[PDB]
């Protein structure tokens with residue numbers, strides 16, 4: 001084939017990037033996050049009790065309104081860092097961009113308020129490998145590859161910086177290739193450690209001059225569903241001490257006036273230095289010395305087998321356009337524009 005279709009993404013406050021998919025005949029519409037760190041598709045179900053307030057606030061799939069719906073009913077539970085959604089498997093036609101596929105997805109009947117009552121999106125489209133798929137369900141990019149329509153068996157991500165009072169493009173994913181209008185120069189490609197997870201070798205993490213962390217190598221999950229960069233608690237505690245940042249209940253903060261003076265943070269991937277300046281990783285709402293500003297970095301201890309591992313999320317992808325290569329099992333990086 002020769003198709004390279006794209007999906008416009010919305011940017012809610014640099015922490016939630018979501019686009020649209022359509023499920024069923026006629027299509028039912030859902031805002032969903034495209035997540036390279038999970039491998040299942042799920043949307044809230046009409047059979048979800050209104051006791052769950054998330055199911056009152058979000059859009060629900062109604063199986064009985066779709067002629068292309070096909071019942072399965074097998075129970076499904078999805079484990080995340082924050083917790084758990086639960087429900088049953090269903091099958092229907094799913095449209096994403098110009099591509100339509102028959103997909104097995106989860107109809108979710110238990111959505112906890114923490115965190116989904118803070119989600120501007122409805123569900124998740126997992127972009128990982130079948131090795132991580134609960135129920136061993138075939139992931140959606142697998143079925144898309146099966147259609148022989150993509151120009152190349154790749155997909156790529158662009159996350160823009162949030163613009164207030166402007167209609168700037170929030171984000172864009174491309175199925176089948178990459179958009180040169182949103183990256184300059186050529187891709188630098190880094191092979192996966194193993195098929196089954198969008199994870200690469202990392203050789204060091206620098207706070208300015210000194211290689212403070214990960215000197216003998218660590219892991220880096222490239223996670224399009226992660227809002228912040230994350231590392232192990234041990235690493236992040238050392239990183240924040242070097243930055244002079246204080247911890248609150250939720251976030252790591254610095255005084256807003258001191259933000260731009262913070263040293264760069266460099267991730268050593270594929271023998272190249274991927275640097276994020278304080279202008280890249282600090283939510284700079286003000287410059288007042290009597291106000292604290294959030295860093296887009298926090299600790300998340302990911303358990304075996306995927307972890308311990310860093311997660312390069314939106315904080316990282318905002319600066320580096322990312323191409324996920326299924327055919328050659330690699331990840332490409334190029335400076336975002």
Ligand SMILES: CCc1cccc(-c2c(F)cccc2[C@](O)(CCCNC(=O)OC)[C@@H]2CCCN(C(=O)CCCNC)C2)c1
Pocket residue numbers: 015016017018033035036037038080081082115116117118119120124223224225226227313314
């Ligand atoms: C998208 C999947 C997901 C899972 C769990 C929680 C959330 C979530 C939420 F439900 C409400 C608000 C915020 C969030 C997140 O911040 C992610 C937003 C969507 N992703 C995105 O746009 O990325 C650029 C999560 C809050 C807890 C920590 N976290 C994760 O662990 C992400 C895991 C996804 N990869 C497996 C982010 C999202």
Ligand SMILES: CCc1cccc(-c2c(F)cccc2[C@](O)(CCCNC(=O)OC)[C@@H]2CCCN(C(=O)CCCNC)C2)c1
Pocket residue numbers: 015115118225226227228229230250251252283285294298300311313
């Ligand atoms: C804003 C403080 C904070 C710190 C850490 C986590 C969270 C948090 C949460 F506890 C539950 C759900 C969602 C979130 C966040 O989405 C952070 C993303 C999770 N990190 C990640 O990617 O892990 C892998 C926040 C929810 C409120 C808005 N937000 C901000 O960052 C607001 C900062 C702007 N200040 C001006 C995200 C919030």
Ligand SMILES: *[C@@H]1O[C@H](CO)[C@@H](O)[C@H](O)[C@H]1NC(C)=O
Pocket residue numbers: 071072073074
């Ligand atoms: C549900 O899926 C499994 C395969 O993953 C299949 O064996 C079973 O028959 C399906 N259920 C229905 C009702 O088709």
